[PDB]
Amino acid sequence: GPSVFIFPPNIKDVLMISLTPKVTCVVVDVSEDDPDVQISWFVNNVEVHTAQTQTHREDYNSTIRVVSTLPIQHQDWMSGKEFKCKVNNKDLPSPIERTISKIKGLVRAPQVYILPPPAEQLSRKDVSLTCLVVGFNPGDISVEWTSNGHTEENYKDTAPVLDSDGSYFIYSKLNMKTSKWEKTDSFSCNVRHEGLKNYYLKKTISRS
Amino acid sequence: GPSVFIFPPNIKDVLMISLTPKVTCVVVDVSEDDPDVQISWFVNNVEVHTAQTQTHREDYNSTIRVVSTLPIQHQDWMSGKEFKCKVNNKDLPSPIERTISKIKGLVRAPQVYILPPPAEQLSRKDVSLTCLVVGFNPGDISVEWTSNGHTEENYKDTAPVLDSDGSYFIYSKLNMKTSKWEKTDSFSCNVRHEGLKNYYLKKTISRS
Numbered sequence: 001g002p003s004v005f006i007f008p009p010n011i012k013d014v015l016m017i018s019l020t021p022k023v024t025c026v027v028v029d030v031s032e033d034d035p036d037v038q039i040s041w042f043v044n045n046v047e048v049h050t051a052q053t054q055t056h057r058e059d060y061n062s063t064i065r066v067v068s069t070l071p072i073q074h075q076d077w078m079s080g081k082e083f084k085c086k087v088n089n090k091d092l093p094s095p096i097e098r099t100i101s102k103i104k105g106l107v108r109a110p111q112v113y114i115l116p117p118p119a120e121q122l123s124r125k126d127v128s129l130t131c132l133v134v135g136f137n138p139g140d141i142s143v144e145w146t147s148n149g150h151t152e153e154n155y156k157d158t159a160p161v162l163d164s165d166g167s168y169f170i171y172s173k174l175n176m177k178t179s180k181w182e183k184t185d186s187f188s189c190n191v192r193h194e195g196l197k198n199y200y201l202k203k204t205i206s207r208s
Numbered sequence: 209g210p211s212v213f214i215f216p217p218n219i220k221d222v223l224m225i226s227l228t229p230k231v232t233c234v235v236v237d238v239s240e241d242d243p244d245v246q247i248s249w250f251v252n253n254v255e256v257h258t259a260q261t262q263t264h265r266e267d268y269n270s271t272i273r274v275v276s277t278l279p280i281q282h283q284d285w286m287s288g289k290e291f292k293c294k295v296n297n298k299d300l301p302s303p304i305e306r307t308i309s310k311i312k313g314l315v316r317a318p319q320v321y322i323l324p325p326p327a328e329q330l331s332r333k334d335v336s337l338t339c340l341v342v343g344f345n346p347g348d349i350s351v352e353w354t355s356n357g358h359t360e361e362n363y364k365d366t367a368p369v370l371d372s373d374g375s376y377f378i379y380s381k382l383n384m385k386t387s388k389w390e391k392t393d394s395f396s397c398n399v400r401h402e403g404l405k406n407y408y409l410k411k412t413i414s415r416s
């Protein structure tokens with residue numbers, strides 16, 4: 001029959017109070033004859049009624065998926081409360097249950113560094129700024145870029161990578177125009193991580 | 209029953225004529241009661257008899273794993289010959305075949321940069337040298353470090369990461385004592401890739 005998977009909120013949504021973190025329950029391979037799925041939600045075994053549930057046609061392989069996202073309180077995630085979805089359908093003998101909560105573990109704040117472009121790039125039209133975020137636990141982190149205050153979108157980062165000392169690091173590569181590098185005052189690597197004071201740390205660099 | 213997985217040689221073994229690349233077939237979930245397995249190997253459907261096979265007791269879940277590695281010629285892998293293992297066992301109705309060969313893809317040679325430590329890190333007891341390798345296809349690459357000729361093993365790299373332009377990049381971080389950053393004359397990032405001349409490029413950095 002159908003399978004069910006549960007997912008934690010995005011770490012950025014958890015650490016940014018103006019955003020809405022959500023726990024997600026996904027019912028995969030729902031039968032088309034039988035698309036009625038009831039998904040109910042529990043926070044520490046207390047039922048809640050705020051989840052938004054949608055059916056999606058998966059055109060990759062012509063299947064159906066039902067996705068339920070429960071909006072949650074940030075502090076409830078951080079303080080270790082259990083979120084649980086119960087899925088009922090006809091093709092299911094008994095209801096299938098999934099539970100998730102935040103893993104209580106080692107917390108270690110990252111160091112954040114910005115590396116200027118390599119010298120070899122300074123004669124080209126485009127340069128790469130590198131944000132190196134090092135020594136954090138756990139491995140969940142948001143890393144974004146701005147120039148002065150404006151959001152920069154033309155970056156990619158790596159997976160968090162577990163180092164030999166048991167902590168993680170990540171690289172983020174921002175490509176911008178050498179002219180922009182020359183004219184713009186400042187570029188900022190903005191890091192959200194639970195070990196940081198206020199969950200937030202900005203590092204800024206300028207061309208000299 | 210059991211299943212069979214086939215794995216390619218490691219890119220470094222492929223690109224260094226002095227090393228021995230191997231195609232590997234792994235049989236998982238062979239029963240403790242029937243650990244015997246028959247395995248044959250074919251290079252372009254000619255049987256070869258050079259494979260090394262070891263059986264492992266997987267005490268974790270009381271199963272058996274058989275790993276067979278065929279040593280292969282570099283040119284045979286690079287030129288796209290088909291490597292095939294056929295596996296039989298009591299608990300398999302008919303023999304399982306797995307095949308593998310090198311994909312004929314785009315080959316794009318990367319640029320290699322070495323970045324010095326970020327300025328804010330030079331106070332510490334250890335500094336990080338960053339090797340940034342940008343714009344390669346396919347995404348198989350070997351990145352290693354030397355100080356002059358001598359191997360420097362205290363490094364971790366990211367996965368290759370697929371960029372915006374459909375090429376890959378990768379970061380490699382070598383951590384070193386700040387004292388060696390000031391004493392040692394040179395550190396080298398050594399990149400082996402299909403698209404590089406002689407499959408090898410060395411980039412070198414010193415403190416200035």
Ligand SMILES: *[C@@H]1O[C@H](CO[C@@H]2O[C@@H](C)[C@@H](O)[C@@H](O)[C@@H]2O)[C@@H](O[C@@H]2O[C@H](CO)[C@@H](O[C@H]3O[C@H](CO[C@H]4O[C@H](CO)[C@@H](O)[C@H](O)[C@@H]4O[C@@H]4O[C@H](CO)[C@@H](O[C@@H]5O[C@H](CO)[C@H](O)[C@H](O)[C@H]5O)[C@H](O)[C@H]4NC(C)=O)[C@@H](O)[C@H](O[C@H]4O[C@H](CO)[C@@H](O)[C@H](O)[C@@H]4O[C@@H]4O[C@H](CO)[C@@H](O)[C@H](O)[C@H]4NC(C)=O)[C@@H]3O)[C@H](O)[C@H]2NC(C)=O)[C@H](O)[C@H]1NC(C)=O
Pocket residue numbers: 003004005007008009010013021022023024026028029058060061063065
């Ligand atoms: C038909 O096709 C569909 C679609 O297939 C996919 O899409 C196409 C286009 C191609 O890319 C396919 O190759 C794709 O696969 C098939 O559906 C898929 O079915 C799989 C089942 O066979 C199922 O498998 C794995 O799922 C998770 C990983 O899921 C994430 O990554 C997948 C990519 O690998 C994605 O497909 C998923 O979408 C999912 O991605 C995450 O999604 C969440 C929720 O949307 C999202 O979080 C939310 O994001 C919001 C913003 O977008 C916001 O932030 C919200 O607040 C937030 O909540 C994530 O951000 C997003 N991340 C990414 C990177 O995309 C695996 O975990 C799972 O493994 C577990 O189960 C197997 C057993 O089956 C075990 O072997 C395995 O070890 C795991 O077991 C678990 O182990 C841990 C620790 O070991 C334990 O703690 C757990 O208890 C234990 N759990 C269990 C249950 O055992 C699966 O391997 C895919 O999710 C699913 N995809 C979708 C989209 O539904 C379908 O199968 C096909 N049908 C047929 C008949 O063939």
Ligand SMILES: *[C@@H]1O[C@H](CO[C@@H]2O[C@@H](C)[C@@H](O)[C@@H](O)[C@@H]2O)[C@@H](O[C@@H]2O[C@H](CO)[C@@H](O[C@H]3O[C@H](CO[C@H]4O[C@H](CO)[C@@H](O)[C@H](O)[C@@H]4O[C@@H]4O[C@H](CO)[C@@H](O[C@@H]5O[C@H](CO)[C@H](O)[C@H](O)[C@H]5O)[C@H](O)[C@H]4NC(C)=O)[C@@H](O)[C@H](O[C@H]4O[C@H](CO)[C@@H](O)[C@H](O)[C@@H]4O[C@@H]4O[C@H](CO)[C@@H](O)[C@H](O)[C@H]4NC(C)=O)[C@@H]3O)[C@H](O)[C@H]2NC(C)=O)[C@H](O)[C@H]1NC(C)=O
Pocket residue numbers: 211212213215216217218221229230231232234236237266268269271273275
């Ligand atoms: C009982 O337990 C065992 C052990 O379980 C593990 O250990 C315990 C303690 C726990 O930690 C568990 O969580 C662990 O799982 C279970 O065995 C496991 O069974 C899995 C299947 O049930 C099997 O699954 C995946 O295997 C490969 C990945 O394998 C590599 O990565 C793993 C994770 O890193 C490693 O652990 C593996 O050992 C393996 O590592 C690779 O090993 C090769 C071979 O040695 C090595 O290459 C050689 O290396 C040499 C140097 O040492 C030298 O360089 C040689 O030249 C070189 O050849 C590699 O270096 C190394 N690689 C890496 C990355 O580390 C997955 O690829 C595979 O995925 C496929 O299957 C599913 C479904 O088909 C798909 O989602 C997926 O896309 C793949 O499908 C493929 O898709 C393509 C197209 O996209 C098709 O063309 C393919 O044909 C298609 N394949 C098929 C078959 O259709 C599996 O998901 C685990 O490997 C295996 N673990 C071990 C250690 O054997 C067992 O299941 C349990 N039994 C139970 C519970 O009943």
